[model samples]
Target chain A: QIDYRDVFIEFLTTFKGNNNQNKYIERINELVAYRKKSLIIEFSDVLSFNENLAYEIINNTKIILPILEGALYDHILQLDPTYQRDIEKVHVRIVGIPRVIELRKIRSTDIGKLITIDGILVKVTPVKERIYKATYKHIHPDCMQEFEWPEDEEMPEVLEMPTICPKCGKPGQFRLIPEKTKLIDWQKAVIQERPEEVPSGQLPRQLEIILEDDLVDSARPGDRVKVTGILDIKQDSPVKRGSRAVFDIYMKVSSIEVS
Target chain B: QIDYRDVFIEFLTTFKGNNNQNKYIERINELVAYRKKSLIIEFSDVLSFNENLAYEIINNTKIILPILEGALYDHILQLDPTYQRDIEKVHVRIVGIPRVIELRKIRSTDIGKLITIDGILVKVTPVKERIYKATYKHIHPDCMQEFEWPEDEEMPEVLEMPTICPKCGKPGQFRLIPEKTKLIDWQKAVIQERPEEVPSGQLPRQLEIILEDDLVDSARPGDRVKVTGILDIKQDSPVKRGSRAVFDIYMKVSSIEVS
Candidate 1:
């Protein structure tokens, strides 16, 4: 698979300045050194020589984007090992200028594709810490086998007990372990199309944007802002008695720019 | 971002004759025409020009792979509107010449990357229907507000009650809406490393593989297989008495080959 971490590192290290198309490792050094959260490389910087490469990056953003963010986090960790003590992952966003799009024009085809939308923030949810990881210890008095799991987006109301202890033969023997940094900051907000873009007789189109880590609470209701994100489908929670196989589209917001 | 759906369509349409790309289109048409459950495309045909594109495809397989599958479904639906009545998603998988890796070598970085592993199926879970989408109507006699949610991979023992109806002021007012296709077939299996791959004095490393849709129940225990899939992380359910934040990694099997 595209080792995007390597690609991102290469992209950063070999970024050629527009002036002479010269390799400038110093520029990337500063980005990794200062611990930048988002790398806003101009589309011109990387894609100028190879338009096809732009297609490659945009086509694979779903995979490459996360890797890029993760690479940044790892880079930061390497720079300051002490950063792990209280580090919330630096949610790095890789943005291209041409990907800017409008809310009204967003379509089902746009789902999972990364794009930027300019809109008015109409609703905001309070900042909350959803569990990012969960750990459990076996309940067997003699064999307290410990296991850990990353929490899924859908929080099950009742966790199905493991049939038997993988480590020990005892069944129904798991106790939860508490952790401090397992939870991450999360928030939600809705972005509505600008009034000019909304038809006179119809309701304005709006899209939900989920903010995580440092981006949460960065924008408030009534703020005109630009949000770059991937259009993701958040399946409706199935706890309801009658569930359909339909999905709702929302934006997994990467970076927020308040106007 | 590169809207993969369009790129896929463009790739299908613009493919040149390497022994006739026209027949290739017809072949795809027939696949959609017959309503096949999955579309298996050779990685070579599409990425011959740029070998790196293969990694891009595999890395973004989770997102683009689904889009490619959905596009085929949508294309079928377009050809025969009534096809929607019996339509379930047709998965799309991109397979390369066999490149197998050992279980021990799988890294944390490969969590979302795609790979092929050879192993013997040791344990299997009974097939079950997992709710993909769920719908609920409000409880108030007059406030028949309807709400819907996507079911999580980990089924909760107790369904979470919506605090308040978004449409109506009434609390605890939602009823379930059952659907024919809302529930999807799901099964799980454990694949143990080849005995030879196991290190001296150590138990063999094994990884769980989740099979869904047409891929479920396709293999029996003791089958030696090369399974191509994207490595995915499944979070532990939280409703247990004590829960800690952590995640378990598993393979979201895309294609299975039994030998």
Candidate 2:
């Protein structure tokens, strides 16, 4: 009857499997052992461990990922005292969703929902720094405030400084020193259905994918890969309020099976 | 508190406009007076009259269309003694939504939501019977159930018979008498962005629109049309659970600007 956060935190903390080796404990150990930034926790392990938490995580990745990651970070601190984990620190690689939607099947209804897809890597932009936590020092003389960029509604693609000094109520520029801003390797890639799946007359289906940290650059162009991620609507910006309100769909790839 | 069905029935039965007359009353009277099957009820009329109902209908068309139609049918019943108005009998053409979404802006997020768009018709199929109310008479000896197709999750593109007789729980064939089946004029039309708005590199944005009754023959190809309707996902069938789970988007257009 506990909240999902408490339940999953406890679930991932000490969940066993047929392996009887405390399944996720070793997985958590590697990040500390190898200084790895990702934990490949297959959905089957979670589904087998606890069906309710597994489905809840699948049903709401945006909310659940952070909660599971909280437990993930908790374990990191317990195992390695100096290991600091936050957003973009430790990746939660959720694999084997059992529901694989073809490239053509992706739609806007899937915005914010988890999906599994297998497609050819059509395009992959070179990895670059995506602001993980932007440090903003309060610009106002009256208020001494320092804070990091918040977890936004969508994935953090750009730095969003606090609009005003919450402590002073002064609205002005905030000093964002680059040295203080945390970073991550990020790449945007395009995946399309294989040539075989292309219908006779219809255009080949395509999807936009973003990969991070250890998952980035894992697949080369034209490589067929099975990946899992959460679908989200891409509204680059609200530049013109009066113009057409068009939004593209994109995914933050969580896991890619590596041979 | 009265339900939306009762509220809207009362709204149309007695709502007034700036002219200080029962606006929707006259709008409803035209259907019976002229024996027309379509009613052009402006959203502004509803918006100006009842803010509560206007926003409700704006948010939900699949649910609201039937509610307003019930009101329209009630008005028909009140005005004409023998007027038999059912699904096919009246088309609620909701106009003037105040928000016009560009053709390029339409996406899967818009499914079942009311939207207004202005574009040029590129292709329109010849008018055809869309099977407004499919008739089904039970074929089983144990059941004598007869009924018209219900308002479906998606718009009625074809007939849908009940899987089992509600009265006898018999699963078998049902007799669909041709004469008892209701009918309506319908056409599928394509609307795309005008030449000026078409982005230089991107393909001209397009949308699938449907026209019914008095609204069908009003527009020709290449005509600049401002129309309003509800967005819905197009699922032709469940033929292949394994096939790429893809669903196109379409609309049941309710209004067209005509001189």
Candidate 3:
């Protein structure tokens, strides 16, 4: 039998003192000093594999745990008032699939044994972050239009009514609120930096391709793409600066393919 | 027959092309792109199992490609400039050993497939690097006083040297630097920060006992570890700014451990 229990118990023995005293208690305190860290991985290409494949990739994988996995993930951090917000966005590359491996395996095992993992992990060595550049394209929410509904103008609260949704219905259970009262431009997420203009006097020869992974098929620029998706508000919130307004015309991107 | 060669060749071919060819090509390109992206994996406690157990654990395993293994190693990238130098560096982890399952002849022939192997690769997703704090102690050289050799030093051009270590007086050496000019500063590759004095008032009461590998059982803090490396001269040869030049000593930290 592979004595995993024995190995784990022995590993734990170092932390707990023989009977009563634990001399190494002070060392354990230094483990969770820093809370959040970010990692960005770039994929060669973005391929959407089925969820089954995603699960298989995470199996048997051992990630960093200086003291323990919980310690590494703990967020017992106090926030500063002046700080707008603190978020750690861990971006994973859309790689093929993740596979788990043990420590004893791999070519680097020889050198790893000489370092941190021999017994108790005190401090981990730090390294730099990886950064890269990429292109972005939009392909979502089939339709977009603007309309207005005046206040004090009460239409029937169509509840499960025909030609109307159970909650709010104009037609197909849709509501037209021109410039709804709430703010924050949700379109910014999908917006990418515009390509540099080709110059004033130049012949347009090659196609300007819009490579959107959300698009079902390759949709080149100047080419119409047939797309159908739910048209829903990306976000609606209270506005404090100017006025309380909602960007009623929003989008829920769905299927898109070049015609 | 389900030909592995065909799939491999097809995927490899797509690696060089974009999705503009066909819809199927575009879809496949996404999958291929995922494989090219890097995964970062951190190993906290890695141990090797016996061959039998290792095989069992590796079977039916799945891994995503475009993964980068994150681990620390001590070495000096000698060819790089100071800013670009990789000292005690971490490399983009690549290469993998996956389990290969061979299909039964009967099952393969009936299914129109000669052989089918199912396996997963261990993928390492990158995480932000962690900083490590350590104390350095020297164990060799026997003395702390610096020595000054004459600037007009010369050696016999036609004479042959014996394969012996002058320090240990050992013969038949396998690896040895012919002169001090060849010595490397391994710390430049591994250490992330310059050696700064630890704060006295805020220092912990305990010495922060840590479990280290068995290699450096004899090392201690505040002790200078003995090393054999190259001696570097920092002089303004273009200006000849007074002969009082500074010298930098570089050495490979072969072993540094504490009990």
Candidate 4:
């Protein structure tokens, strides 16, 4: 196993847009005044900087997204000593995802695959503030290590923590430190196929997608837009409460370009 | 098969509250200025007025609700010849439901049963306007009949209509009369059990519910309230768009009383 952190940092640091401007650095310089902690970059830049990185991003977001986010945070820390992101990592959004697929063409095989979709925003739920991550102290006498857990924007139930301590390598009861819990913005939306894309006599396709952080409240319900996201599976709502074989695919979208 | 419309009309007509006021007519007189077409009545009043009516309301709401709605519309017509509701029938909201059950105790057997629940409204989506019931003209030359279909507040797909004309008894294609399509307000919400009802070491129970017509936007998301509704089944979200074997229970709530 290898850490791709340094390589991603290198790609962002040396990357230049078509106009010869240092892409990420220019974006980061404005973050403080703009009150934004994350940055968005073009996929064309990444593919030009490193070919394998492009393929990895489109194919493996679950593991790569956080690593890339950390790389962004790390490079910013070196360039600006005063730079501080409250969370451990900042986000990296990629627009112009190379492979755009029609909503009707989406398949089970596309789960975990990066797919860009263009559609009309038919529904948008109100932005919700939720606990994204938090630190807890292991209560066992033999293990006093503090560990962190994440909400990952899933259902209402609490997720299980590590059986063995991350630091002490021993098992114990964990108690949440209320003040250490970090909150983030989350919104759920539905996208439907454009009229031209639907075959006559057939219904338009729809995909339930989610937006997080700064992306929340950035788009309107009836806007035409493009989204780059990762397809994933969730137990259907009814089965989510309790199930045998009910699942539906949803997208955790990263970038939105409204037209 | 029986006509409960007249009986329900008589119940609302001759019935009076403890204060010796005719419930429905007094409500109707106030309706002109209130700009509300629906009327809310107490369950205790129904029980006191007639025992069998109360039982039928609780057990057979599917057949009884529409009949009661028709009765309300019919009685209003006789008293106020100039009064009008636009659509075919008005609504009757029954609050102060007698049977209150904890959220977790709701079961599959409760489907189609009118149940009352008390909870904190955990989530509320924005009100959406939809084509509730619409009249359409038969397109076939041989058949000339007008028909109506209901939205019933279900999933995205268009529902199937009758294969033959309801009036002419001849087969024909139907075309929607956009102008005749009646729109109604619709909203979705989730209710969570009170903290005291949640068992120790267990997650609080939740039920997805819906509100239609004048009932929409009647309560805030966090308000503590009681709801009287019919429990129904919907295929979970993923399957709602696509299945069998995955279904969840939801309530088509008729009344909400904020506390």
Candidate 5:
């Protein structure tokens, strides 16, 4: 019912500084230019698509950063459909201040705002490739001399176990397992908005927590266990074209052993 | 979020005539009599142990309904949540008043006004001590018959064809087996705002339609279908004390048959 995309765009133009507002106005002009261009336009005596150029103009315009609309919506729906209300109501509180590139620099005598920006930084880019991998996992095993107990799925069990250092194989002699669970491992995963552009071959650290495990006997519904994962990027950008994977990001967990 | 229940109640009171408003206000006062009584006393003597009653009052009063908090929450959650704004601003033009009732007979002699009164009636008393009897039934051999096609529960086929003539006991040729298939005949029923007292039974009707299957399939959701069912009434004065054996008035279907 509410045109939220336009609402956000309007809010951003006004909420950001005057410079940022001009940038958005330039983007809107760029969008209009691309939208209104004809197929037979001559550019430097060679046929060329202006979409990438137009996108580049828009990409650098905002502090909040716009992403691939499709990817952002996919993530939003995953969070909750009923949250359409939340999506409409809650404005993304964009911290408009450029990320603190450098705290106040102090060399005993020169006490002015001597801030140096990191020339190179990592940002998220969309990936066209479909890759789904387990970021982490934990399981309950049948009782053995090496193992102490089972797990219940509704609650999480996180405990440090000893690493038996005979040091040949199976690095951890004792590891936690979820065993004898009444309920299944019920976990919900949702996608969130992706950034418009990211440095090629750069990855960011991402994390999630498994709240409960049905396999462990001690687990209850609300228990949580911390998990760490990596962000994977794919080179889906085409020659003479910007990346189609503007906001695509996925999680990959290397290990799932319980702590 | 706006408390829609309170808003709706307030709006209804404002829109209702003095007579109708006074009736509900009196009912609310009557309910306040057992406000802080013991759980058992409040439950048995007041509110009919109804969770709906408790939720309405608790929402307005901000006190625990004396029943379990969890139970009260469950009831409130089941009801339709309130409405809120989504767009920055939008204009809704109110062209005409929404229809509230079938008719107010005192204002106009047109029977059309009273015609809608049938629907305004809300059920105040729930059925109790239902006296049921089993009769003979027959299923056609060739019909594409299904016993609870999608769901597990099923009602036995009603025999709509009458075997004996009402004038004589002689076996009569009947097209439809009318025994089980014939809906129970109902005599009288009441639709009131309060259980203790009421002016008259709303939509006073004696005959109801009988169907072959669950009455739910025959009616739309929220549409009241009065079926003629035989009743065994002990007395008609105090609702809690008197039980009824109905033969003319019948069952009211509340939900849809998905198929």
Candidate 6:
């Protein structure tokens, strides 16, 4: 039994009170002052309120995510005005996954849900700068129109490169003008089921972990790690593009731990 | 059904022959070329030869650690001498901990053993440069005697700071004379057992991990990580100095993985 209103109220009161209402306040204040984008809350605090509520928060962060951000923004407002105002979206992440699952045991039911998987890191690709803002320009010298799009954790797949200018509708005269872009650090690593986790006489399973921003380079190869993230499915391209209707699943990681 | 000789031979042939003897040959060559100090080997490759031997390699790396280094050094001799001659000792590490045991469950039999542990990274201290070479000057101005000591992975603990110079036996007259030295990146982090690993009625256990060189900064706080390292114990000091006789255990981390 859990109530979102009570959670929101408790969060707000904890944020306003001068006393050490919650252990996370100092961490939140640091994040607000430093403009960091993630607040990692231990699951025990929530368990003290209600065990079921902790599970709900882990499974679906949608409800509490906003409350955490609102509380952080409210704290930011209290900080000196000298701080940057255009703060990035803060994410609320819960550690202490109650039942850590094996990679092979993850199923379709886990998709779009938060889960924890533990394994050894086998491969690590170098961190690359991913486009946060992609821009398209008109080829025609006279045309001033341009198209812009922003990206998030997953960049939207472009069906085809825009050859013809969208503004001028010119086939060859218009050219792409790229502008006003942002980028973030992106890295990838492969996690294989720990040897202990694999059943005897069976091969271990592996999963691709997508890490972004501060999470990139959090671990090196051969490190035993536990990853808590949403199990996401990437829909395959349409059959017209020589692709099938299948989907590829990966961990859209929020917080990484070396354990 | 594991043959240590075949494993040794396979490793040696892979190191000696130019043909693609195995996937690791190219990686080993790159390491030899770039002069990296650690060789990360997949457990499956060796396990394919002998499962028990694989366990032996991981658990009793002491017996095979030197053997692996000797073989690698022998191969380096075959490469053109134009390469740098001062090669650091290459450490052989096996990925995938077969038995991911709780730190609390680690018994005396586990001390000084190579093992891996998984936990949440709770704290990470700033990387500090420690002294690799220490020098002392004699107090007697006429003696002009000096002594120098070199350090390796474990920093030498000084009990009395050498109040009486060893060379001159002068009390409070000797001074530390800094000389040729080397500094390496060193960092410390604390990993607490995941909520799942903790028994329902008990608190979680925590272990301190020491990381060096490139391994530092591999994980951030709140990251679910697996750390591959040796389980080591540091005996406590005498009670007269506010120290206990009991020994404290810590992880001498070799690698880190973000799960």
- lDDT of all predictions, in order shown? 0.66, 0.69, 0.22, 0.72, 0.25, 0.63
Worst 10 residues of 1 chain B by lDDT: B150-159
Q: How do these models rank on lDDT, best leading? A: 4, 2, 1, 6, 5, 3
Worst 10 residues of 2 chain A by lDDT: A238-247
Q: Using alpha carbons, what is the TM-score of model 3?
A: 0.16
After TM-score superposition, the amount by which residue A75's alpha carbon in candidate 6 deviates from its true location, in angstroms, is 3.5
User: Tens digit of lDDT per residue, candidate 6, span B1-259?
Assistant: 4546556657545443335466676776787778776677766666765576677777677677677667665566567344445665556666676657676555434555678788899999999866655565666756667665321222243222344455655545555565544466789899998998776654566888888777888899999998887765432231121212123467788667787
Interface RMSD of each: 12.1, 21.0, 35.9, 16.6, 33.3, 29.2
**Candidate 6: residue B145 lDDT (0-100):** 71
Q: Best by TM-score, which number?
A: 2
lDDT tens readout by residue for model 3, A1-259: 3433233223323434346554223222332233222211111111121232223223311222222223212322222222113322211112222221221221322221111101111121111111011111111112122322222332211111123232233332122221121111111112111123234465322211111111212222233333222223222222234654543321222223332
Return the lDDT, model 6, position A179.
Answer: 20
Which candidate leads in DockQ? 1
Candidate 4, B-chain TM: 0.79
TM-score per prediction, in order, is 0.47, 0.50, 0.16, 0.45, 0.17, 0.43
Each predicted complex: what DockQ? 0.03, 0.03, 0.01, 0.01, 0.01, 0.01
Fnat of all models, as shown: 0.06, 0.00, 0.00, 0.00, 0.00, 0.00
* Deviation in Å, model 3, residue A58 alpha carbon: 38
Q: After superposition, how far is residue B27 of candidate 1 from its true place, in Å?
A: 4.1
Q: Residues B1-259, candidate 3, lDDT per residue (tens digit)?
A: 2333233223323333234353323432443344321112111101121233223212311111101111111111122224123232322211122311221101111111111121111121222221121111222355222111111221111122222233343433232223322121111221111123222322211111111122123333333322111112111231111221111111112222211
Error of 4 at A105 (Å): 38
**Candidate 1 stretches greater than 4 Å from native:** A1-259, B1-3, B13-30, B49-53, B74-84, B97-100, B140-144, B150-161, B173-181, B239-243
Q: List the residue pairs that clash in candidate 2.
A: B112-B231
> Model 2 over residues A1-259: C-alpha lDDT tens digits?
5577676656666787776667667667766777777788778877876888888778877676877776677667866777764333565778888878877645333445688888888799998877777777787677767766553322245335555565565767788767877777889999888778876654576788889887889988878888788765344432112221223557778898733
